[PDB]
Design a protein around this ligand. Structure first.
Ligand code: M2I
Length: 268
């Protein structure tokens, strides 16, 4: 009955935001879920970079030494918003450093370099299929994947699919034991999400998260694995979009939807 408990709060929040909010939250030590537009497609924006790092980790379980491989790249690999890879242009970075850069700073050149190693957007989509995710699709590279065009299913997933895949990758069996904790650690070190899901959780909770911000169509998001102290983890995804290209995204709307979700689950 949790979903019904939050139906009207969510609807009014999305009315004042002026767009659509999609939320899926899951209590793993209870089974409880909260859903609002959880099956609708939303643009992933940079939030695909979390799964990108997971796909790299998965591949590292077969290709020994993959994480320490040095990757050298030219100025032409640089793309707007590559704050980490800009600084190692003259030296190269390892696959693990690119992965951490993609997760924790949304580094765009790092994301494209890793996508190339994985076989492009189809390679990443393939990895997500391999863990049971039939919704996720990545179709383009940075920065074209951010167009967030209304009705366009390219480079989208659903809040529900994002949460289910995140749970499999951070808490379940989709990744081997060291890779899973490495993924968690990268998510925990994220620097871009202080005003989204992290803003809605108590200071003593551990949090790993990945953000996405398309820059257009009021489209922005965050997904997170959240550890209440001494309790079982909560996994959740908050995705927004709006009808007009010039509509602005709201970090506060995302934090508000996270808090609503956690209160709906009864654990806030
Ligand atoms: O251009 C930006 C950026 C940089 C600084 C400040 C801001 C502000 F506007 F917030 F102040 C935005 N970024 C930030 C980064 C991101 N990752 N997840 N959300 N945004 C990202 C990913 C892909 C393309 C561009 C970008």
């Amino acid at each position: 009955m949790l979903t019904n408990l939050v139906a009207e709060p969510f609807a009014k929040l999305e009315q004042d935001f002026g767009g659509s909010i999609g939320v899926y939250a899951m209590d793993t030590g209870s089974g409880a879920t909260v859903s609002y537009r959880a099956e609708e497609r939303f643009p992933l924006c940079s939030s695909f970079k979390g799964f990108l790092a997971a796909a790299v980790l998965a591949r590292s379980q077969q290709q020994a030494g993959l994480l320490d491989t040095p990757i050298r790249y030219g100025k032409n690999a640089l793309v707007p918003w590559s704050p980490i890879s800009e600084k190692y242009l003259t030296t190269g970075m390892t696959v693990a450093e690119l992965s951490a850069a993609a997760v924790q700073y949304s580094d765009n050149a790092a994301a494209n370099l890793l996508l190339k190693e994985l076989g492009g957007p189809a390679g990443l989509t393939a990895f997500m299929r391999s863990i049971g995710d039939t919704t996720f699709r990545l179709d383009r590279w940075e920065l074209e994947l951010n167009s967030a065009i209304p009705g366009d299913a390219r480079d989208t997933s659903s809040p529900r699919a994002v949460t289910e895949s995140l749970q499999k990758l951070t808490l379940g069996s989709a990744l081997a034991a060291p890779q899973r904790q490495q993924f968690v650690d990268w998510l925990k070190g994220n620097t871009t999400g202080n005003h989204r899901i992290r803003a809605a959780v108590p200071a003593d909770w551990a949090v790993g998260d990945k953000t996405g911000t398309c820059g257009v169509y009021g489209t922005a998001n965050d997904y997170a694995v959240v550890w209440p102290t001494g309790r079982a983890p909560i996994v959740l995804a908050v995705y927004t979009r709006a009808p007009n290209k010039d509509d602005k995204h709201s970090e506060a709307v995302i934090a508000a939807a996270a808090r609503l979700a956690l209160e709906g689950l009864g654990v806030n």
